Amino acid sequence: VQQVQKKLAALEKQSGGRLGVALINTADNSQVLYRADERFAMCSTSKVMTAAAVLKQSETHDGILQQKMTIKKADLTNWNPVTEKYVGNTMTLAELSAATLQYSDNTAMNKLLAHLGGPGNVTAFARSIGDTTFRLDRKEPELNTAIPGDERDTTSPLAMAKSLRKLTLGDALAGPQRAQLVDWLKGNTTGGQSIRAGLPAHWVVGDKTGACDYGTTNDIAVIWPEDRAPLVLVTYFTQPQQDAKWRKDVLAAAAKIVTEGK
Ligand SMILES: *C(=O)[C@@H]([C@@H]1NC(C(=O)O)=C(S[C@@H]2CN[C@@H](C(=O)N(C)C)C2)[C@@H]1C)[C@@H](C)O
Numbered sequence: 001v002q003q004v005q006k007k008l009a010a011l012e013k014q015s016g017g018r019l020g021v022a023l024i025n026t027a028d029n030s031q032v033l034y035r036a037d038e039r040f041a042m043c044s045t046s047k048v049m050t051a052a053a054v055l056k057q058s059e060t061h062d063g064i065l066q067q068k069m070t071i072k073k074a075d076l077t078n079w080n081p082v083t084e085k086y087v088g089n090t091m092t093l094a095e096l097s098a099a100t101l102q103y104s105d106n107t108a109m110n111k112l113l114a115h116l117g118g119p120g121n122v123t124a125f126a127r128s129i130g131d132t133t134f135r136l137d138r139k140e141p142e143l144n145t146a147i148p149g150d151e152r153d154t155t156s157p158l159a160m161a162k163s164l165r166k167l168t169l170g171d172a173l174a175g176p177q178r179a180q181l182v183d184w185l186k187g188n189t190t191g192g193q194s195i196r197a198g199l200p201a202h203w204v205v206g207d208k209t210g211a212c213d214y215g216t217t218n219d220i221a222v223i224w225p226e227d228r229a230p231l232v233l234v235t236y237f238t239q240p241q242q243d244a245k246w247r248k249d250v251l252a253a254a255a256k257i258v259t260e261g262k
Pocket of ligand 1: 042043044045079104106140141144190191208209210211212
């Protein structure tokens with residue numbers, strides 16, 4: 001059905017930006033692709049691979065998720081909805097992971113990066129699960145420049161869709177860790193206006209949004225349409241002006257377009 005292709009193409013043209021979509025239907029492994037092999041800056045969506053790297057460690061290191069880290073007034077970044085509540089005290093890695101994933105807390109992200117030894121370690125983890133496109137280069141907030149043509153902190157919609165699938169439904173993570181990642185993605189509190197907005201209200205969704213410079217507005221999610229096989233969806237969107245406004249409505253439209261009737 002190229003109807004979807006035409007609709008996506010029109011959506012992009014009308015938006016005046018560059019749209020990236022990758023949908024994987026686990027029912028038969030069919031895919032809906034639109035610039036699925038092009039690179040897009042990930043913004044907060046890179047936080048999923050990051051949190052997953054920590055979960056991977058917990059498979060061998062027992063109780064690591066309960067390990068504590070101190071939050072100093074110096075760790076605070078441009079967005080600390082949760083961490084700012086702990087300046088002077090501690091947060092476990094689980095709490096930190098939850099904070100970065102569900103509230104997109106930047107301080108929490110850098111705390112996880114520090115724990116992992118830097119962005120290069122997240123990239124290594126991605127490679128270990130077969131993702132040869134993903135690449136994390138900087139920490140928060142520099143990783144959000146999203147400069148057109150810059151390959152730093154980018155990935156493709158398809159590569160991210162495959163990795164999200166491997167992580168949440170596949171074998172990239174062990175049972176317990178897989179369940180925690182899914183639980184965290186379902187508990188996201190910032191996706192209300194994105195992919196979720198374009199889906200029937202009773203469908204169950206796990207997702208991670210993101211928004212940064214050049215009006216880059218992203219979202220990656222796993223969708224369970226009632227009792228049907230899960231859908232893995234990545235909607236990436238970026239614009240020409242560095243100061244462009246975010247277009248969460250564009251991702252919602254894209255989501256409706258590709259998931260309608262699934
Ligand atoms: C990540 O991409 C940045 C971070 N992540 C997200 C996100 O939704 O994933 C938010 S955007 C959110 C809606 N717009 C802002 C505002 O409306 N609030 C005050 C409610 C927050 C945030 C931009 C991170 C890299 O900085």
